[PDB]
């Protein structure tokens, strides 16, 4: 499933149901931080990060998360132009 | 104020008061993501990230945050050995 497929799927779901629809992006190489894409409804997107170990609670980062954070930064830069033509983000 | 001064100050506060004590790290160059250090009480540390614009709510990252995330990764790597001898982190 590509990013665009996920974006499209979350958009359609958030509309049919009138509530946030979410999906974990499976960014290659990430060890612990999980990036979740959210479609918030007239549909705007955001991305939140989560620990696999306390998935529902706010993430506490430690120094061992440095490489994850870099991979997330790289993924953002790699898809930046596309995302900025394709979706609107949360305020 | 160095990282160690902040760590020491938050440790002393979290002990005198028996509750989480927190302070924003002023990592040079960050535009929007704020890293806050927390001493949680028998004292363990964590770091949480926050948007300056919705400081109390969970941060929604967008592609413009890529450089902040890299600077946070660099700061973690720069202080990694020190932190791992000097403090214990949250589970
Ligand atoms: Cl992910
Ligand atoms: Cl965590
Ligand atoms: Cl792109
Ligand atoms: Cl900061
Ligand atoms: Cl935000
Ligand atoms: Cl160090």
Description:
The structure is a homodimer of 91-residue chains. Chain A is α+β, with helices and mostly antiparallel strands and 91 residues long. The first copy, chain A, has a single domain (1-91), classed as 2-Layer Sandwich (Signal recognition particle alu RNA binding heterodimer, srp9/1), CATH 3.30.720.60. The first copy, chain A, is 40% helix and 23% strand. A three-stranded antiparallel beta sheet of chain A has the order 1-2-3. In chain A, strand 2 (33-40) and strand 3 form a beta hairpin. The longest helix of chain A has 21 residues, at 66-86. At the A-B interface, strand 3 and helix 2 of A face strand 3 and helix 2 of B. The structure holds chloride ion (CL) (6 copies). Residues 24-27, 30, 34-35 of chain A line the site of one chloride ion. The PDB classes it as viral protein. The entry lists the keywords viral protein.
């Amino acid at each position: 499933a590509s990013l665009k497929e996920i974006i499209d799927e979350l958009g359609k779901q958030a509309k049919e149901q009138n509530k946030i629809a979410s999906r974990i992006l499976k960014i290659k190489g990430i060890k612990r931080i999980v990036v979740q894409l959210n479609a918030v409804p007239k549909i705007r997107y955001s991305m939140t990060i989560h620990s696999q170990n306390n998935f529902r609670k706010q993430i506490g980062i430690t120094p061992q998360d440095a490489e994850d954070l870099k991979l997330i930064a790289e993924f953002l830069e790699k898809y930046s132009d596309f995302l900025n033509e394709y979706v609107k983000f949360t305020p």
